[PDB]
Subunit: 258 residues, 4 copies
């Protein structure tokens, strides 16, 4: 779809599952060269690698924990070693776990902040460093959420991580705009990743989730991957510092019932 993405090198964190996997595959369809970071050898990154190649791309995998600076550096170095450059960095890894806020253990708060916000900072930091050093007009996409604007009871750490990610992105976008580097957030609403489809199998829970979505359906991973491909492309040449919400209307509030 986007001819300019052919041959671009894109690194994606948390790409063995979910939205990261879907983005990897979509960049494959665009004939990009994808670095699939994954967290654990309990996962199946090689299946993603095969799907990216089948779709029309090239791919390698690399284990790394985005809460470890050395591992983030190694993700970037993997792009350089395997494909010779880096063009697009997608900080997608994230976690969540609900607990009443007055009871939330500090170590749970810390894990969510470290993965979701600090990890995205480190990935952004490392990619931008490389881009500035090598005069690359690179692109960073940070995977946020509707929860960068909509508060989330029982998930104060998650909300804080995404609200922080918004200002992190805006600051990096402003700081590095003169270098021709673009930095943007995607804000998904409720998406039918495997894990979410399973937890929302219960018809009552499913209906509750859908009640929050004006469009009336839970989105598919490909509908988020579409956004990432567009933002990374030169079609979005004049777009930086934004959050592009792809949420079925969730940021408007719950579905309207007359």
């Amino acid at each position: 779809m986007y001819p300019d993405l052919k041959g671009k090198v894109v690194a994606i964190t948390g790409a063995a599952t979910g939205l990261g996997k879907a983005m990897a595959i979509r960049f494959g369809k665009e004939h990009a060269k994808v670095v699939i970071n994954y967290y654990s050898n309990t996962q199946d990154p090689n299946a993603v690698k095969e799907e990216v190649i089948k779709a029309g791309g090239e791919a390698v995998v690399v284990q790394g924990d985005v809460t470890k600076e050395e591992d983030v550096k190694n993700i970037v170095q993997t792009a350089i070693k395997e494909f010779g450059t880096l063009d697009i960095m997608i900080n997608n890894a994230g976690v969540e776990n609900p607990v009443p806020s007055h009871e939330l253990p500090l170590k749970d708060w810390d894990k969510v902040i470290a993965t979701n916000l600090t990890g995205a900072f480190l990935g952004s930091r490392e990619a931008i460093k490389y881009f500035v050093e090598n005069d690359i007009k690179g692109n960073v996409i940070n995977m946020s959420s509707v929860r960068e604007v909509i508060p989330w009871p029982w998930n104060v750490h998650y909300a804080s991580s995404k609200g922080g990610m918004k200002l992190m992105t805006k600051t990096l976008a402003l700081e590095y705009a003169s270098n021709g580097i673009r930095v943007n957030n995607i804000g998904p609403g409720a998406i039918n990743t495997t894990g979410n489809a399973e937890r929302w199998a219960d018809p009552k829970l499913k209906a509750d989730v859908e009640s929050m979505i004006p469009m009336g359906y839970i989105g598919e991973p490909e509908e988020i991957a579409a956004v990432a491909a567009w933002l990374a492309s030169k079609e979005a040449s004049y777009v930086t510092g934004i959050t592009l919400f792809a949420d079925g209307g969730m940021t408007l509030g719950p579905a309207f019932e007359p």
Copy 2:
């Protein structure tokens, strides 16, 4: 680029010049059927029609003043008469004129509100009516500005019109989401439309405009047309109620100078 736009009927207000013209031409490249509304026979809508056809589309022209309800209805009827349906409505017409706010004549305020905000309401209203009557999963794009969020001294009427357009869009998006209708704003920053390129020919004024733009350049009309094509396409299937800023970073504030 977007195969699903082939054969879609798109009506664009204020399309004899500027961003409306650029959007018309881009939808031509996507093989759409374009209704080019224009304000005055002092303009050259037929040149746009020819460019849309050359680009790969079909096109007709229709005169109409978006501050006249009958004329807005006639724009929609022109789509139905000429092409048999309407799929995408783009409310692009606008005006501006700077005056210190405490001195702004009411008739100037009224003209800007009527064109920029009421006109977009009427166009949105009429398109959505048609879509609901005919079970069309249609799309409305309202042309806003960075001035839906950034205040604009000497242009209180313009700012108010765009701030209002934001809530107009969000409300229609929420109200009609269950009908499969998407409604979004585009928020351009400073763009090199012919009129702006002329007024910004003065090197000092040009530099002042550029100083407000983190990316350091004034955008081209095609960079806005790219956004409209994407939003109207099924790539943006899960996107409604947003404002997609395409502004070189202007909503981040002025360019960063260390």
Copy 3:
């Protein structure tokens, strides 16, 4: 409560009822000199005048329709004639009426825009002109709503008027900040004015209103009047261009149900 408000001249539109009345009486408690604008003498503005006086203030009444520039000018002139100056302008008059948006008559759209947005522009324009000409470090308070940020199906004209008011206020605040003039919005949520106690008399409608309010109760007019007294006072000396939401949490979304 605020010693600096004693003897300040405050003009309030729509002050014979509802929030405007409550604000008039509160400024009376602060020993201000209040210009009570009213729409019709069938509203009993003289009863408000008497309540302002009993509360500790001075007051006069003046009829005027904020959709007529001459009447807005006459409100400001009344302050000058009766009390010798103007210090605070509160643009409070407003209307609403729900209709499905694709069916909303232009007449209705126009009435809401004219009252709610253009009327506030004219009152702001006129007060600021006086303040600038006379070196008054004046204050303008525009009565907005949570609907300057929360969309409102069936009320697209109302939402547009308040979204516009946000950018009107921000623009005036920026334009006139160097003159020492402050301009701010108040954003009430659901308030138990007489008109809304009627609107929400039905127990099921009331319950539904309350369900949208995290604090769980519909506010009282005095809770809004408190905000206006503070913003007008020197306690808020460093506050301009804001919207102060007083909404029981409505902008957070509906009440949280675990």
Copy 4:
């Protein structure tokens, strides 16, 4: 000024200097019972205690580092032990340090996040727990910044911490609204605390700071303390989940130059 604050117990972090000190003294003027948390005894917290007392309040001091959960718990325990209850928690401690973002050490990132965001989470968590357990209609004030909305090149950790604080506050306000607990941010612009008078002593730096402020002056600490006293008081009974910016117009953008 606010009669309902007499005898209320307010704990304030970072209260030996700057805005925290100013808030302590202002609550003293309101005849509150103030718990002055301080970081080091080299800051002379007992001088603040004496100023609170002279102003009309009661006060105790307690050392604690808000990056240690046990110290945060001990702040809350100090209120209970010394004064018998807690009514208002003000999470004010903060740090900053500018570094180009691609060069920012993780250690520095971590310190800013831990102090500014995690520290405010822990103080909020602990106060809210107490309030819920004891049926107190308590209040939390988190000291944010204009940088919860305005990006800040070279200060990505600071901006992230405040952007996160916004969503932390909104989430807690929503989660606990039904308990009658209010949670709000204050968003100062540039304030003439001792540390910033030092930072901005240079005339050219000072002028540049002022150029970003529509009102044209750097605020004084008492102008922020005024906001905290109001938000903590029953005047703000219907106010929760907001950010009250007190910034001379900074969120509007830089001062307007025609």
